[PDB]
Scaffold this motif. Structure first.
Motif, PDB file in Angstrom:
ATOM      1  N   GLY A  40       0.798  -1.208   0.000  1.00  0.00           N
ATOM      2  CA  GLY A  40       0.000   0.000   0.000  1.00  0.00           C
ATOM      3  C   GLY A  40       0.834   1.263   0.000  1.00  0.00           C
ATOM      4  N   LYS A  41       2.101   1.155  -0.415  1.00  0.00           N
ATOM      5  CA  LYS A  41       2.975   2.323  -0.387  1.00  0.00           C
ATOM      6  C   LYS A  41       2.493   3.369  -1.381  1.00  0.00           C
ATOM      7  N   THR A  42       2.166   2.929  -2.594  1.00  0.00           N
ATOM      8  CA  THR A  42       1.677   3.868  -3.588  1.00  0.00           C
ATOM      9  C   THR A  42       0.280   4.360  -3.211  1.00  0.00           C
ATOM     10  N   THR A  43      -0.545   3.483  -2.624  1.00  0.00           N
ATOM     11  CA  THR A  43      -1.858   3.912  -2.142  1.00  0.00           C
ATOM     12  C   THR A  43      -1.715   5.014  -1.091  1.00  0.00           C
ATOM     13  N   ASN A  59       0.256   7.787  -9.956  1.00  0.00           N
ATOM     14  CA  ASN A  59       0.425   6.346 -10.118  1.00  0.00           C
ATOM     15  C   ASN A  59       1.850   5.901  -9.779  1.00  0.00           C
ATOM     16  N   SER A  60       1.988   4.599  -9.462  1.00  0.00           N
ATOM     17  CA  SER A  60       3.292   3.962  -9.226  1.00  0.00           C
ATOM     18  C   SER A  60       4.358   4.491 -10.187  1.00  0.00           C
ATOM     19  N   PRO A  61       5.432   5.093  -9.688  1.00  0.00           N
ATOM     20  CA  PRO A  61       6.494   5.553 -10.586  1.00  0.00           C
ATOM     21  C   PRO A  61       7.614   4.531 -10.766  1.00  0.00           C
ATOM     22  N   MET A  79       8.995   8.886  -5.493  1.00  0.00           N
ATOM     23  CA  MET A  79      10.041   7.997  -5.985  1.00  0.00           C
ATOM     24  C   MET A  79       9.730   6.548  -5.660  1.00  0.00           C
ATOM     25  N   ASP A  80      10.179   5.665  -6.552  1.00  0.00           N
ATOM     26  CA  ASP A  80      10.177   4.224  -6.323  1.00  0.00           C
ATOM     27  C   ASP A  80      11.493   3.724  -6.892  1.00  0.00           C
ATOM     28  N   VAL A  81      12.403   3.281  -6.023  1.00  0.00           N
ATOM     29  CA  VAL A  81      13.718   2.847  -6.480  1.00  0.00           C
ATOM     30  C   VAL A  81      13.794   1.332  -6.665  1.00  0.00           C
ATOM     31  N   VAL A 103       9.406   8.143  -0.819  1.00  0.00           N
ATOM     32  CA  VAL A 103      10.396   7.274  -1.448  1.00  0.00           C
ATOM     33  C   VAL A 103      10.006   5.829  -1.146  1.00  0.00           C
ATOM     34  N   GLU A 104       9.393   5.161  -2.120  1.00  0.00           N
ATOM     35  CA  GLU A 104       9.100   3.739  -1.982  1.00  0.00           C
ATOM     36  C   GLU A 104      10.371   2.926  -2.166  1.00  0.00           C
ATOM     37  N   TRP A 105      10.516   1.873  -1.351  1.00  0.00           N
ATOM     38  CA  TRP A 105      11.686   0.974  -1.395  1.00  0.00           C
ATOM     39  C   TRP A 105      12.975   1.703  -1.028  1.00  0.00           C
TER      40      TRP A 105
HETATM   41 MG    MG Z   1       4.204   1.268  -5.195  1.00  0.00          MG
END
Ligand code: MG
Ligand code: ADP
Length: 152
Positions: A40-43, A59-61, A79-81, A103-105
């Motif tokens: 649920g990180k992007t949520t 949306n999810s990057p 961010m999503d690394v 910052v996801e991940w």
């Molecule tokens: Mg995500």
């Protein structure tokens, strides 16, 4: 002040926490998000963006690493690394910019992260149930969690 915890049973409750958190965001804040794919990180980020007044879809990057949204009350650097090993990007200008970074991940680039941040962990707890833990690292984020729990 240092740690806050919530349990949610649907995506809307997760966005509601993020929406409220955004009321206390300040230029230069860095929030990290960890958890499984589909946790649920992007949520969370979608609700955070709602809190900043962003109307366009967030949306999810995953496949661009970074996405900028400037129409809110504060610029949002999402961010999503996850795919960083395939990407230099100069994430430092965003981390220490005048917006807020989610910052996801983030722990995949731990050594590039600012020392201080608000760490958000989203754990699965059964079907649509999540356990969300805020951990504040730095006076600024202790300040932020202070305000959030007081108006929670
Ligand atoms: Mg995500
Ligand atoms: N309590 C909850 N909080 C957040 N998402 C939930 C919850 N219950 C079910 N979901 C669903 O789980 C998925 C999470 O997707 P996403 O936010 O992209 O995950 P991540 O970014 O962590 O990989 C969404 O399909 C959402 O509808």
């Amino acid at each position: 002040m240092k740690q806050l915890k919530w349990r949610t049973v649907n995506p809307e409750e997760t966005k509601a926490i993020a929406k409220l958190t955004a009321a206390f965001a300040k230029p230069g804040d860095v929030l990290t998000l960890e958890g499984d794919l589909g946790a649920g990180k992007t949520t969370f980020t979608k609700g955070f963006a709602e809190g900043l007044g962003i109307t366009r879809i967030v949306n999810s990057p995953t496949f661009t690493i970074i996405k900028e949204y400037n129409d809110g009350v504060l610029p949002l650097y999402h961010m999503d690394v996850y795919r960083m090993e395939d990407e230099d990007l100069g994430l430092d200008e965003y981390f220490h910019g005048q917006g807020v970074c989610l910052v996801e991940w983030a722990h995949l680039i731990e050594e590039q992260l600012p020392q201080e941040r608000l760490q958000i962990v989203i754990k699965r707890a059964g079907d649509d149930e999540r356990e969300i833990t805020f951990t504040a690292v730095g006076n600024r984020y202790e300040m932020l969690c202070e305000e959030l729990s007081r108006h929670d």
